């Protein structure tokens, strides 16, 4: 029973750089026919598997042409020469020579970029969510690079603790940037004892943490 | 062209059955294999096998040999995977992809089905205009939003007025909390100019639980 390996798991890129995606194997690949049935596909975020290269180095139909693979026996190279927003997702090796067919684990392909400051909003909960007995506050960071940020709740400038949940987005496939939301949750009771609620964000981008905040019942 | 669509959301207790299907069109179906990927959260592709659809014979690989079966409709061009015996090990998304047997690679897959295997019971969202706070006489862009609440299991499918805007949006991974239930956000960016021209409705649908819902966000 083969293996597949792949290196690493994690490559991060910057735009117009090359990348190198390497996959190894147990066993030579090459069929007694003649034949190496080493494939990858890319994985974009979400998405369905989209097929790239098929036996070693064939560009599959509308695959752009700074794709490239190649190796032979067990060493096989995966190579995204001048690396573009879009190439961001999982790349997996398959091979079907020897049965049964296997992937390797995927390599995550990250964009590195400049830094970029995220536009920070605010919102109150809504009145049909109060109805309903509870009160969630949504603080959102958006387009920013890079993941991390602190962010922080300040309720009637009293710090919270674990009461919120952070959300990020992966990498955005146009200018590589995150989205991040944070949500304070509290009783609707709660809510009601106080009065200002605010998310300081603390990031690379920003010079000095940017504050943003409400009174209740605006 | 080719293309693969496969049925729904999929939410069962351990032990019941699941039977996931992949309808196919644009190409003859009779001459091509049809291959079934595994995709647990978070991890690698595996591929469990196959089944030639011009003799209708199955092969499995060692892991999915015992409770995985693959079925035809040949007149209806559909394919069919069906688990049995359902254990927390089969909650993940499962993939028919396309066989070309000239080159021995799958080459137009399915858009992926989710199956959630739980004792627990479908419990749908809850969705909450995340309201914009800016006011449409100033400059600058706007920000809006859904909480979908309280639901399980993953996934709901959220969209913006139909689907007809899509630049913009960023839909939150779901998160956990401690009720044993998710959450999430989506939210769009848009020009505070309109936010008094036009309406904003988030589509959410979540159907395991069989909830289709639209909100209207407003001021
Ligand atoms: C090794 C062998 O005899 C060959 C004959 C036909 C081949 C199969 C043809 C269909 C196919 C499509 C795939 O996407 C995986 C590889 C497979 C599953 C092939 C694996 C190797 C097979 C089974």
């Known amino acids: 029973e083969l293996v597949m390996t792949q290196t690493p798991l994690s490559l991060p890129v910057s735009l117009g750089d090359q990348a190198s995606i390497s996959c190894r194997s147990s066993?030579?690949?090459?069929?007694?026919?003649?034949?190496?049935?080493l494939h990858w596909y890319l994985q974009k975020p979400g998405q369905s598997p989209k097929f790239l290269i098929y036996k070693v180095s064939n560009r599959f139909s509308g695959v752009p042409d700074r794709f490239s693979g190649s190796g032979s026996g067990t060493d096989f190279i995966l190579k995204i020469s001048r690396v573009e927003a879009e190439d961001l997702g999982v790349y997996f090796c398959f091979q079907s020579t020897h049965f049964f067919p296997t992937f390797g684990g995927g390599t995550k392909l990250e964009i590195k970029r400049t830094v970029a400051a995220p536009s920070v909003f605010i919102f109150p909960p809504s009145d049909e969510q109060l109805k309903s007995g509870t009160a969630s506050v949504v603080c959102l960071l958006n387009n920013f690079y890079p993941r991390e940020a602190k962010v922080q709740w300040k309720v009637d400038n009293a710090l919270q603790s674990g009461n919120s949940q952070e959300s990020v987005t992966e990498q955005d496939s146009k200018d590589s940037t995150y989205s991040l939301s944070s949500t304070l949750t509290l009783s609707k009771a709660d809510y009601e004892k106080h009065k200002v609620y605010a998310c300081e964000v603390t990031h690379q981008g920003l010079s000095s943490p940017v504050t943003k905040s409400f009174n209740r019942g605006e | 062209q080719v293309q693969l669509v496969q049925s729904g959301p999929e939410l069962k207790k351990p032990g019941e059955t699941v039977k996931i299907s992949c309808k196919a069109s644009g190409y003859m179906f009779t001459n091509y294999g049809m291959n079934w990927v595994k995709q647990a959260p978070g991890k690698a592709l595996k591929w469990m096998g196959w089944?030639?659809?011009?003799?209708?014979?199955?092969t499995f690989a060692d892991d999915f040999k015992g409770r995985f079966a693959f079925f035809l409709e040949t007149s209806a061009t559909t394919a069919y995977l069906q688990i049995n015996n359902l254990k927390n090990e089969d909650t993940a998304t499962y993939f028919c992809?396309?066989?070309?047997?000239?080159?021995?690679?799958?080459?137009?897959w399915g858009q992926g089905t989710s199956v959630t295997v739980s004792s627990a019971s479908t419990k749908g969202p809850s969705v909450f205009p995340l309201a914009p706070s800016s006011k449409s006489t100033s400059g600058g862009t706007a920000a809006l939003g859904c909480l979908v609440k309280d639901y399980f299991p993953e996934p709901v499918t959220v969209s913006w007025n139909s689907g007809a805007l899509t630049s913009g949006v960023h839909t939150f991974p779901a998160v956990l909390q401690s009720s044993g239930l998710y959450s999430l956000s989506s939210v769009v960016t848009v020009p505070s100019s309109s936010l008094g021209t036009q309406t904003y409705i988030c589509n959410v649908n979540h159907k395991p639980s069989n909830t289709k819902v639209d909100k209207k966000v407003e001021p």
């Open positions: 066993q030579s690949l090459v069929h007694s026919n003649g034949n190496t049935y």
């Open positions: 992809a396309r066989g070309t047997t000239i080159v021995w690679a799958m080459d137009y």
């Open positions: 089944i030639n659809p011009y003799t209708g014979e199955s």
